[PDB]
């Protein structure tokens, strides 16, 4: 079995741990969990039936029974935790966005590469059967010659502290726009944009509120998206060519419905766990099973979200937030 | 009764004439129709039961029984027909877009104004009960403080000669984007944009193929739209604020469904005519009844689509097509 170590005991680590404990026991085992104090770690290990608890991430990195670390910390704490785990020879699945700016991602990627260790950014949406089916539709040429595509992700998250906080690098782009940028990149074959235009406005807590981006892609196609932590949007994503449109229905970030030229297709989520902190949390199973398949094949990154594309997504996101003057200490 | 004169006998004039002939006989009468030859005009007058036919527009302008002229010519022929009718003291309802560039619209508007004559651009969408209901939702503040809105209009019209022809000023912007620009202007109170960014690509017939625009509006709100004559899009339009979203469902340009914060509302079209050349053609009744209400009140333009806003819509459209190098002889 693939032996997992859980870094951080917040809500997302809770969901991911519950998912891993629904998978075949001969394929995945949760062997250890670290928190920034032993107390929190033991409470989590007892609730989730993990056999070892640590009060520092460093102790988890050093556990020789852990093969892969899941870094579920808040956004600004991803980098140090990843770097610790890689220095200790662990594979790492890092939560999204992998880092808060382009240089953090480059640093993590250079480290993983220099040590021949697997690293993947947990962009869970890419592994949903719906998303895989859209990629086939594109490979098959069903929509004809591409023209453009548009994604949107907006909800009123003003009462979700995580989400609006400057100190945790929250705001529309890093919480929600990350899903729009990855979708547009995916439909256009992970290609670097030729040009980006941005409009948006800030939120009174120090982060961005609502942001729309236009991206020129190579071969005369382009994408746009809108994200927001105050305004509710359609929360769909689409791609259109000369023969028609494919759409991933709301919830786009976690789609189970694909519509192609008016024809609907539903992809049910796994049955458990239910009651996950986050909508459709059960769908995290797909990325978990993907990491095991990569590691069994001896791969040092995923073909579905390669490290060079994580770097490009980071470059894009950083360019967008700089265009509207939203700077971070890290940069 | 309001006495109408029909200029041009194409498909749209066919639909508008059929609509007017379903209205109360004491309110609207179709008294005359002109075509560029008598033959075509008589055939149309016989099919549509109009009592007078002319083989030139000038003869219709001069008919003292005509009170209002409906100019249904192809795009580049709007200006000369409008100018002829206004010089002859007729009110004019001119089909969309009123002119092919900003100067044509300014010229028509200056002429109407200098003569104290009603002129309105036939932006039929604005008069649908659905659109009026969205304006109320906005006036009521139901969506909270505005944030942004997005419209799209795309279909494969490559086999519709009108639509792809350079000589008739076709293409995505003048055929379909005009609906997106008017919607965004309407939700943002007809205000002039502070900035416009554009990406798009040309079509091999000499006109634009697919075009996406980002528009900054005053008060930190913005809109975007995508239009295309090759790629099928969602064909919905939406506006979102801090308390939720309103959407006009497909067909946006001709909506009968409004969704506000998840609550659906349907507005049925008039029952006749049926079998109109254009989708939901029966809805042209609303703009026809509006022109009569303006004229009965002695108004020289519509408060719903004032001439200064037609000028601004034209200015926008022209700026967008220049940004992607699509120039016309007229400019
Ligand atoms: O990823 C998500 C957290 O907001 C979806 O809301
Ligand atoms: O106005 C319209 C003509 O395309 C709608 O298709």
């Amino acid at each position: 079995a693939l032996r997992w170590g859980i870094v951080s005991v917040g809500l997302i680590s809770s969901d991911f741990t519950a998912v891993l404990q629904t998978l075949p026991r001969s394929e995945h085992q949760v062997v250890a969990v670290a928190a920034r104090d032993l107390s929190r770690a033991k409470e989590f290990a007892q609730k989730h039936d993990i056999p070892k608890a640590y009060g520092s991430y460093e102790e988890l990195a050093k556990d020789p029974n852990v093969e892969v670390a899941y870094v579920g910390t808040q956004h600004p704490q991803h980098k140090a935790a990843v770097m610790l785990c890689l220095a200790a020879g662990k594979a790492v699945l890092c939560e999204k966005p992998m880092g808060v700016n382009a240089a953090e991602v480059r640093e993590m990627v250079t480290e993983a590469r220099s040590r021949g260790l697997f690293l993947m950014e947990a962009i869970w949406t890419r592994f949903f059967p719906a998303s895989e089916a859209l990629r086939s539709v594109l490979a098959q040429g069903t929509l004809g010659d591409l023209r453009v595509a548009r994604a949107e992700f907006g909800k009123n998250l003003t009462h979700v502290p995580r989400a609006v906080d400057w100190a945790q690098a929250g705001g529309a782009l890093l919480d929600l726009g990350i899903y729009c940028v990855q979708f547009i990149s995916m439909v256009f074959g992970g290609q670097k944009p030729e040009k980006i235009s941005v409009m948006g406005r800030r939120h009174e807590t120090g982060v961005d509120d609502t942001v729309t981006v236009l991206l020129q892609y190579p071969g005369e196609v382009h994408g746009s998206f809108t994200c927001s932590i105050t305004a509710q949007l359609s929360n769909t994503a689409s791609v259109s060519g000369t023969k028609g449109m494919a759409q991933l229905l709301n919830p786009c970030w976690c789609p189970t419905e694909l519509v192609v030229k008016g024809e609907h297709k539903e992809f049910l989520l796994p049955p458990v766990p239910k009651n996950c902190n986050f909508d459709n949390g059960a769908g995290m199973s797909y990325e978990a099973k993907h990491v095991r398949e990569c590691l069994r094949k001896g791969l040092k990154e995923s073909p579905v979200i390669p490290l060079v594309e994580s770097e490009l997504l980071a470059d894009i996101l950083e360019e967008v937030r700089r265009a509207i003057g939203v700077t971070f200490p890290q940069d």
Side-chain angles (χ1 to χ4, degrees), chain A:
Chain A
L2 180 51
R3 292 184 302 279
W4 295 87
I6 308 295
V7 176
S8 113
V9 292
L11 300 186
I12 192 66
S13 281
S14 185
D15 278 12
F16 193 64
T17 302
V19 168
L20 289 174
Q21 300 188 131
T22 73
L23 312 180
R25 320 182 37 190
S26 73
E27 300 177 353
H28 301 264
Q29 286 164 174
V30 189
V31 300
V33 59
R36 282 175 294 169
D37 65 50
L38 232 194
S39 164
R40 243 216 309 329
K42 290 188 191 217
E43 184 176 350
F44 189 96
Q46 277 294 294
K47 182 195 181 195
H48 288 282
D49 226 288
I50 297 150
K52 191 102 183 78
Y54 297 110
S56 77
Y57 299 165
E58 173 82 299
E59 285 166 275
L60 188 140
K62 288 156 140 161
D63 185 334
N65 219 59
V66 170
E67 283 178 293
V68 59
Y70 169 75
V71 169
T73 72
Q74 288 156 10
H75 298 164
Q77 282 68 58
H78 289 173
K79 190 190 83 171
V82 175
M83 290 301 283
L84 280 173
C85 290
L86 295 171
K90 269 48 172 182
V92 171
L93 173 59
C94 181
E95 267 300 333
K96 73 200 78 79
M98 196 203 287
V100 315
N101 66 21
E104 290 200 341
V105 182
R106 282 196 333 266
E107 178 172 357
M108 287 182 270
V109 168
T110 296
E111 175 78 354
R113 285 171 170 166
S114 69
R115 305 188 87 113
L117 302 170
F118 180 89
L119 171 65
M120 188 177 94
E121 177 170 19
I123 306 185
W124 64 316
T125 312
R126 288 257 177 123
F127 305 96
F128 283 61
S131 310
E132 320 228 320
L134 174 60
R135 292 191 294 275
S136 298
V137 165
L138 294 173
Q140 250 89 142
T142 307
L143 304 184
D145 288 332
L146 292 203
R147 274 319 186 258
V148 47
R150 152 113 179 155
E152 43 174 55
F153 198 172
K155 285 184 167 176
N156 195 298
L157 298 181
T158 62
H159 296 320
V160 186
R162 137 205 325 123
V164 110
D165 284 0
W166 174 82
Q168 285 328 298
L173 286 162
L174 272 75
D175 295 353
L176 313 180
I178 48 153
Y179 288 105
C180 301
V181 171
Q182 68 80 213
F183 170 80
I184 288 162
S185 184
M186 187 186 83
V187 308
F188 293 142
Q191 296 180 4
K192 181 180 182 196
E194 291 178 351
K195 183 176 170 179
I196 304 183
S197 302
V198 180
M199 292 177 180
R201 68 145 278 179
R202 289 178 169 270
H203 190 65
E204 64 262 31
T205 57
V207 306
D208 52 303
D209 180 304
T210 300
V211 181
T212 291
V213 181
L214 254 41
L215 308 91
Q216 179 65 64
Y217 276 75
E220 301 215 284
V221 297
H222 59 264
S224 77
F225 70 85
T226 301
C227 61
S228 180
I229 46 100
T230 57
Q232 170 85 214
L233 306 170
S234 283
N235 302 350
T236 58
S238 71
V239 59
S240 315
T242 57
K243 297 172 180 188
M245 181 171 50
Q247 294 171 282
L248 286 170
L249 303 194
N250 177 23
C252 54
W253 74 94
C254 50
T256 51
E257 301 185 81
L258 171 69
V259 181
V260 179
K261 281 174 206 187
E263 234 76 280
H264 285 60
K265 279 234 40 180
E266 191 184 31
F267 302 85
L268 299 170
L269 290 169
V272 288
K274 307 204 95 67
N275 293 346
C276 255
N277 291 310
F278 297 107
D279 278 359
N280 287 2
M284 290 178 106
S285 61
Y286 305 121
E287 70 182 350
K289 292 183 173 191
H290 184 81
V291 167
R292 180 176 172 269
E293 295 153 7
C294 295
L295 286 175
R296 287 168 54 76
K297 297 157 83 134
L299 311 184
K300 318 293 189 178
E301 59 187 310
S302 172
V304 175
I305 169 64
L307 295 180
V308 71
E309 187 184 12
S310 279
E311 286 170 326
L312 170 60
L313 300 176
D315 286 341
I316 291 168
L317 204 70
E318 179 171 346
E319 167 164 11
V320 167
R321 74 172 160 79
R322 283 265 64 248
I324 57 174
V326 171
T327 71
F328 289 157
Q330 297 94 321
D331 283 16

